[PDB]
Amino acid sequence: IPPKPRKILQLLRLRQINNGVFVKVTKATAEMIKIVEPWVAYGYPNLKSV
Amino acid sequence: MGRLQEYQVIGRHLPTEANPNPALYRMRIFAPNEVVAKSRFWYFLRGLKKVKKATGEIVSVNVISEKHPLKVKNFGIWLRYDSRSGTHNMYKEYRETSRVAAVEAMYADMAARHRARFRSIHILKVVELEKTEDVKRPYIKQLVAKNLSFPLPHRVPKISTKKIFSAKRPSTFS
Amino acid sequence: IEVSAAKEAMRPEGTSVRGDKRREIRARVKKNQKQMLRNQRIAAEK
Amino acid sequence: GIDLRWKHVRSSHRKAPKSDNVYLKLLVKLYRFLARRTEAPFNKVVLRRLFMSRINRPPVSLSRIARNLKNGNEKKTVVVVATVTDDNRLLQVPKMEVAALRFTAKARARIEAAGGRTLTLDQLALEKPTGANTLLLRGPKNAREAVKHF
Amino acid sequence: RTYRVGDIVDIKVNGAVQKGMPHKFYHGKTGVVYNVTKSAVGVIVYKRVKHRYIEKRINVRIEHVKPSRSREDFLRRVKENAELKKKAKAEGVPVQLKRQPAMPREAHTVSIADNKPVTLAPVAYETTI
RNA sequence: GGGAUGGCUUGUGGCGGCCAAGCGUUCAUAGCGACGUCGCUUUGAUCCUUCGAUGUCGGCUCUUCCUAUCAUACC
RNA sequence: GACUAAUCGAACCAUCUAGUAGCUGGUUACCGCCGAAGUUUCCCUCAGGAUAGCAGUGUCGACCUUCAGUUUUAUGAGGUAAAGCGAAUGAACUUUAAAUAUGUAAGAAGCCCUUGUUACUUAACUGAACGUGGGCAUUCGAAUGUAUCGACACUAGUGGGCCAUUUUUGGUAAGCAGAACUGGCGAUGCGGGAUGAACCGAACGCGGGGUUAAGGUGCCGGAGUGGACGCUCAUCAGACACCACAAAAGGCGUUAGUACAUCUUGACAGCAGGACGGUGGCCA
RNA sequence: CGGGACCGAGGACCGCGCUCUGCAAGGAUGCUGGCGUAAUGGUCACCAGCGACCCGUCUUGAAACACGGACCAAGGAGUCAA
């Protein structure tokens, strides 16, 4: 993994495979997630999921 | 290319001070789901109108269902496909009961006969042939013939693959 | 032009790196002309 | 596997003395109890300095104690977790109450002749269990030949 | 423009002279001036090698140097933050002084009465004819 | 003490010019270009012009294989 | 350069002597906790050196201060695409504005104002520096993360190695040769690629259950002779191909298309017939 | 609302609670059978399915090459002083 996606995953607290986090949508977070798209799957969770 | 649905996707450029009411662009997209439909929509407007996803928005996504899914229809599809030579026009005909079924059969047909993937195929027009005289291809003209009837010679009987051995030799006459 | 910190610190104030090659050329020219004048003086004595 | 770019760090400070002095062991037990059961930071600092080594406990002279006794500190109890030494350059020793690990014989005699009191750290624990009205002093740490040659 | 020691400048090799000059790393870089000459200036630039930063010093001619606006936004925001906080204390109302990232767009309704959508094909038929 | 190029190769030259189906181009009419072609490299003569081992091969006995066939077989 | 007791380009014996080697070989129980590296910068090179960087034990200091191979905001480089020119003007046109990564800055340790001096500088008490005093805590002035602090001491190996993606510079008949970043390996086991330094998945205490990745489900072999529509018959098909052979290559193989053209005013193929006269045109 | 598999850590009470005479609420109890011994368990030898290169040294980046090893016992190499 390249150092910038490694650092972004470290800041998103995704250090292990099948770890999941809740993220509030801003530009500052959306750009990070767009960079680490080759390692993560993300989407919009509903009330049942939460 | 899978269980597809036809989507009406309407999008626009984000309003600005200079342009408070931007124009709306509608397309018909054959896609497995709404994410792929919107992605293909933004791809085509990037190719046509120079409108980007970051500077635009989706106004509407709707599903276009077939009006008469229980009626057999003839469909003419005008398409362009990209090969190592370049882009080629093709016109083809499919006898189906819905536009989505015609497009699925088209995708399987181009995959089988020309090895063309989904990304290299542009669907330019799908129309229903209003008259029988509008049918051009012989393989649909033989199917729309008057008093059509045929037998089914050499039918392999349905035998379970878990039944390894049989006591009688099967027949291929029914 | 990249300059090394040690040579920049040892460089006198007011002088720049852009005249170092001219300084070296002037020194070499001065040495060559001194040798030429010595040869001319010896030839004049002969 | 888990991606841990950072590293969990083991402690870099003493948790127990390396000395096998049984009296120091008893003092460490006492101040462990005091620092656990009291809110005074004084007891924690005293226990942690009881853990320390001799190069980390430089001696404190009576001249240094008399220097720090000035400006309203004349009545505070001086606490030094180190050896208290004598300074013969100081001709007049003021009256003082000092608690220390150990005193030299001349320093103890001069304090008792000047009229002060010398205490051990367990006597300090008895009289000031929370370190009230105390002046905590350290000697010069860098005043060593090795530190000069560093 | 007379540059002084300590300010922040931008390096831009202007013109067609950058066709064959050998040291193109510092083009577009921003650094701090440490030395001033009539036609030259000394710029401190930092490079990154793996986990650390290293310092390089370069001599750039004045025509390839412009003053940078790196601290303009910071000094400005300090000024109107002070002024807005002063008027907040004046009229006794809170004011939101922190800059925030862009939020997602809220819900809205777009009318199509005079703006009927235009149906598009993957290529334009005007191009096909 | 340390060491001991490879799905390569085969039958048709190089340089220079021209032509050229086609590829491109048609806000520039350039550029690539097979097939070819044209220039250089004694009336069956002369025998009075052999143009440099750093690189090493052989022979015997004997077995097998390939075909890119000299003979035998057929066309 | 023969012989001088099987010893001779300098015999044999003992001693100095356990001579010296940078070269070769070897170098002895277990478990636990950490754990690496290949021009960074300088020196005349090879028979060269230090040195940066990376590590471990101890400690100490309020383990205080927070920082960060990340995004955002402002502003650079790249104005480069693009839209328009019913805006002006004409990649070099611009109101506006790309993707990719990238530099700088984002607070109380800060921001100014005022006071004077100046040995700087300026026409200049003018800017700036130096100090002086004052005002700003009404929110300390983006996001996200934060068992990630700092300074000493002592100790150790490695410090011009291999492969690969991308960027860039040169090339060859063809191979290729340099740099920069990053990743892997040298130090590393496991699942799959039949097999294996460089491939894919995934990193490792001892066990039980559940679920997957890459890859597979005709048998060897665990899992489908699974489903839908087609294509292909190879005189050693094809099934992990992309490079070369190799070309605008050759096919009376097979299918799907595009363009042009003919067609009941009879198209394509055939069969029955005509295929004439000047004229045995001129020269030879 | 069924059907199945694996597991039962802890050891007076304390707590959160609930459907509140009590409980499925901070970790398994109740009932029953056969046997009470090689029956369970263990060691050794062997067959069977799957897995599995011969160690040490050297070299460089790594392999390969190369070197040592017929077998066993005892001896055998970072010590002492300043």
Side-chain angles (χ1 to χ4, degrees), chain A, chain B residues 1-16 18-49 51-174, chain C residues 1-6 8-9 11-12 14-46, chain D, chain E residues 2-18 20-129:
Chain A
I1 177 167
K4 173 191 293 190
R6 200 200 316 140
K7 187 71 167 66
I8 297 175
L9 284 175
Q10 188 274 331
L11 293 176
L12 286 178
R13 309 187 301 163
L14 302 181
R15 313 151 182 130
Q16 193 184 23
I17 180 176
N18 301 337
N19 282 358
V21 289
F22 285 111
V23 179
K24 167 182 180 180
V25 181
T26 68
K27 192 95 176 304
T29 53
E31 296 298 323
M32 293 177 71
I33 302 173
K34 266 163 217 163
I35 295 178
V36 291
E37 277 188 356
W39 293 267
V40 304
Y42 64 104
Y44 317 136
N46 56 358
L47 178 71
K48 175 181 184 172
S49 297
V50 172
Chain B
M1 283 325 163
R3 179 65 65 192
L4 302 171
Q5 293 179 356
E6 203 184 17
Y7 296 87
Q8 168 195 260
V9 185
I10 303 173
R12 73 173 182 181
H13 196 289
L14 287 172
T16 58
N19 190 358
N21 189 359
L24 305 166
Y25 301 112
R26 171 183 173 271
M27 294 178 71
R28 302 170 71 111
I29 309 288
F30 290 90
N33 53 76
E34 271 203 5
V35 188
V36 186
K38 283 179 293 177
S39 174
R40 291 301 279 172
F41 176 83
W42 284 121
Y43 177 78
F44 291 136
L45 281 71
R46 187 186 325 122
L48 290 156
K49 292 290 183 176
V51 178
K52 291 170 300 305
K53 185 183 287 185
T55 61
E57 66 183 1
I58 294 297
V59 181
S60 187
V61 177
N62 303 76
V63 166
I64 299 169
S65 290
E66 193 75 17
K67 286 190 171 181
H68 302 276
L70 297 167
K71 181 181 73 170
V72 185
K73 295 169 281 289
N74 301 307
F75 289 95
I77 296 185
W78 165 29
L79 62 87
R80 293 186 175 176
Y81 86 105
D82 284 306
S83 72
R84 57 200 191 74
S85 169
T87 307
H88 324 280
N89 278 323
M90 294 177 71
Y91 172 69
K92 279 179 143 291
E93 293 179 353
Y94 299 93
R95 186 160 157 90
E96 301 283 0
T97 62
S98 67
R99 295 166 48 87
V100 292
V103 165
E104 293 179 354
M106 183 278 288
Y107 274 128
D109 178 88
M110 308 277 312
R113 297 193 136 105
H114 298 288
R115 267 76 203 189
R117 284 85 170 94
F118 176 82
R119 281 82 65 193
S120 69
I121 296 172
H122 292 113
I123 314 174
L124 271 67
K125 205 165 294 293
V126 173
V127 293
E128 178 188 344
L129 306 179
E130 307 149 35
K131 296 292 183 182
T132 313
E133 55 164 80
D134 291 331
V135 174
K136 304 301 178 185
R137 302 299 181 189
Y139 48 85
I140 308 289
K141 284 293 286 187
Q142 64 172 356
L143 292 172
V144 298
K146 197 192 154 81
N147 274 321
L148 181 67
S149 170
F150 46 96
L152 299 167
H154 204 87
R155 287 192 78 193
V156 184
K158 277 74 69 177
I159 309 165
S160 179
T161 51
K162 310 301 159 55
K163 190 188 178 188
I164 298 304
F165 307 105
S166 176
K168 304 293 173 67
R169 306 195 92 105
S171 295
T172 63
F173 316 115
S174 49
Chain C
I1 299 173
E2 316 71 23
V3 290
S4 62
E8 182 65 26
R11 176 171 303 274
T15 59
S16 180
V17 70
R18 309 247 168 185
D20 271 18
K21 290 198 166 183
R22 301 270 190 167
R23 279 182 276 278
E24 293 179 353
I25 281 183
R26 254 187 278 109
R28 289 193 297 252
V29 166
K30 182 174 72 68
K31 184 180 183 187
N32 187 253
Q33 299 291 65
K34 184 181 70 66
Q35 287 174 340
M36 182 179 72
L37 290 175
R38 175 189 176 275
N39 276 334
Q40 277 190 352
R41 285 196 310 269
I42 291 176
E45 295 164 356
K46 294 179 178 177
Chain D
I2 190 167
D3 201 355
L4 300 180
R5 181 251 181 269
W6 313 107
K7 177 188 177 190
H8 291 310
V9 189
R10 186 191 52 190
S11 47
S12 63
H13 308 257
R14 274 194 179 185
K15 297 175 173 178
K18 304 286 172 62
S19 166
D20 288 327
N21 193 344
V22 298
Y23 298 95
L24 183 63
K25 288 179 176 182
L26 291 176
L27 259 180
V28 160
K29 287 188 174 181
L30 164 75
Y31 266 98
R32 275 196 206 280
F33 180 80
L34 279 176
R36 175 169 54 92
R37 294 288 311 275
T38 65
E39 294 293 328
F42 179 87
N43 299 336
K44 299 178 181 57
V45 176
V46 164
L47 173 63
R48 183 177 182 270
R49 291 184 186 178
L50 283 174
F51 292 160
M52 293 180 183
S53 69
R54 197 191 278 188
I55 68 159
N56 287 319
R57 292 181 286 100
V60 175
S61 69
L62 296 184
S63 77
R64 177 174 297 253
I65 299 178
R67 170 198 177 96
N68 276 254
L69 279 168
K70 305 180 180 186
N71 302 346
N73 291 345
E74 286 86 359
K75 297 296 289 183
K76 296 197 174 185
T77 301
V78 181
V79 180
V80 168
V81 180
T83 297
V84 167
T85 54
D86 194 40
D87 197 351
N88 52 51
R89 303 164 300 183
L90 175 64
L91 297 186
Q92 295 297 109
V93 176
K95 183 207 271 293
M96 64 184 73
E97 195 206 13
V98 188
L101 281 170
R102 51 178 297 259
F103 299 85
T104 70
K106 263 208 310 179
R108 179 189 309 271
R110 284 191 75 192
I111 287 178
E112 294 293 328
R117 198 165 62 127
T118 80
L119 287 86
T120 62
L121 295 188
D122 49 296
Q123 285 170 323
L124 173 73
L126 273 188
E127 285 169 13
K128 323 265 200 167
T130 54
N133 197 62
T134 54
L135 175 61
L136 191 57
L137 291 187
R138 273 191 291 196
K141 182 187 181 179
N142 291 357
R144 195 188 58 171
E145 43 194 33
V147 187
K148 300 289 94 175
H149 299 352
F150 281 168
Chain E
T2 61
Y3 302 99
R4 295 179 66 250
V5 174
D7 63 357
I8 320 182
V9 290
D10 286 330
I11 302 149
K12 178 184 171 157
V13 180
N14 56 354
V17 74
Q18 78 176 306
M21 61 80 71
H23 292 171
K24 315 192 175 186
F25 173 74
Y26 305 101
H27 171 75
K29 254 62 176 188
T30 297
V32 185
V33 166
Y34 73 95
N35 177 1
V36 186
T37 310
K38 164 193 172 182
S39 75
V41 76
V43 182
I44 300 170
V45 184
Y46 294 91
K47 299 190 178 186
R48 179 158 186 85
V49 297
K50 305 188 179 181
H51 66 276
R52 64 178 180 175
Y53 283 160
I54 61 166
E55 173 191 77
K56 301 290 190 177
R57 294 170 182 266
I58 49 177
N59 185 262
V60 194
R61 296 173 62 86
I62 308 299
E63 58 248 44
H64 312 288
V65 172
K66 297 174 183 180
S68 74
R69 309 164 57 185
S70 298
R71 299 184 63 84
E72 183 178 1
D73 189 359
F74 172 61
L75 298 185
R76 182 180 61 83
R77 291 194 334 269
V78 163
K79 291 187 287 185
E80 69 273 15
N81 273 357
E83 190 276 331
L84 284 196
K85 178 186 298 186
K86 178 182 310 301
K87 72 180 291 294
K89 204 170 185 181
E91 289 85 5
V93 290
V95 66
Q96 188 274 331
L97 294 169
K98 276 187 167 189
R99 64 199 186 278
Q100 296 294 321
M103 308 313 288
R105 294 176 64 87
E106 319 275 344
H108 61 275
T109 299
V110 173
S111 182
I112 65 169
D114 62 358
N115 203 14
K116 177 182 180 180
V118 185
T119 302
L120 267 66
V123 304
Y125 299 141
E126 274 295 331
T127 315
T128 69
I129 186 53

